[PDB]
Write a protein that binds this ligand. Structure first.
Ligand SMILES: CC(C)(COP(=O)(O)OP(=O)(O)OC[C@H]1O[C@@H](n2cnc3c(N)ncnc32)[C@H](O)[C@@H]1OP(=O)(O)O)[C@@H](O)C(=O)NCCC(=O)NCCS
Ligand SMILES: Nc1ncnc2c1ncn2[C@@H]1O[C@H](COP(=O)(O)OP(=O)(O)O)[C@@H](O)[C@H]1O
Length: 197
């Protein structure tokens, strides 16, 4: 099934762009969003996390208290391995369930890392480094110090652009951005049909 890899540095707007493709009928696969769904209120994985570390891991609205989980993980690196063993298999299953359950002409695979050989096409969401730094501050509420260092750990802008088949500058007017997404959608639709034959 035709697959487009969506990638881009932190704060470039991957989620907003993927959400626009989603409103066009495209199946989006994002393990970051699936990981938060397998521990949503009432799920077995959240119960297990609470059974293990205590009810304080569940906040007033029945959702995971990620502050206390971070602290626990930070104080006991052994719990990260158990958390992985718990969640990783649930993310794999829910990833395949969404693939197998897709009737869309093509599939959008959100992948922050770059896994460039697994997809039929690579779409890079790009913005200037400064824009990356600010949009991180207001989206996550973190500090810039932490933002610069998160950005240092990732691939460089030139690296992403060099591996891209298509690029979308998530800057300027949203309408223009959404229009560019629609044009790419039409392109990918055609590449999917071509591939089918
Ligand atoms: C908030 C109050 C009315 C009830 O406290 P509580 O029953 O412990 O409520 P919660 O479990 O939702 O609060 C857990 C704490 O972690 C925070 N928290 C909860 N879920 C979180 C998450 N996913 N990420 C980060 N922080 C989170 C809450 O803001 C709260 O901090 P706070 O106590 O300084 O307000 C009261 O006790 C209080 O602390 N004031
Ligand atoms: N064209 C734009 N102008 C202003 N803010 C934007 C634009 N596009 C995206 N954003 C904002 O940037 C923030 C981070 O984007 P996000 O989708 O989280 O990127 P990523 O998923 O790559 O981290 C979001 O809060 C979003 O509202």
């Amino acid at each position: 099934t035709y697959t487009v890899a969506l990638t881009g540095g932190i704060g470039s707007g991957k989620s907003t762009v993927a959400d626009e493709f989603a409103h066009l009928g495209v199946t989006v696969i994002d393990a970051d969003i699936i990981a938060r769904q397998v521990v949503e209120p009432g799920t077995p994985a959240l119960l297990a996390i609470a059974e293990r570390f205590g009810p304080q891991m569940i906040n007033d609205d029945g959702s995971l208290n990620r502050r206390r989980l971070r602290e626990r993980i930070f104080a006991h690196s052994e719990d990260k391995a158990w958390l992985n063993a718990l969640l990783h298999p649930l993310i794999q299953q829910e990833t395949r369930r969404q693939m197998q359950a897709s009737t869309s002409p093509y599939l959008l695979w959100v992948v922050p890392l770059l896994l460039t050989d697994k997809a039929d096409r690579i779409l890079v969401v790009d913005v200037p480094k400064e824009t990356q730094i600010e949009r991180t501050i207001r989206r996550d509420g973190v500090s810039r110090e932490h933002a610069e260092h998160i950005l240092a750990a990732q691939a460089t802008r030139e690296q992403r652009l060099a591996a891209a088949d298509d690029v979308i500058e998530n800057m300027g007017s949203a309408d223009a951005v959404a229009s560019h997404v629609a044009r790419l959608h039409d392109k990918y639709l055609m590449l999917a049909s071509q591939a089918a034959s």
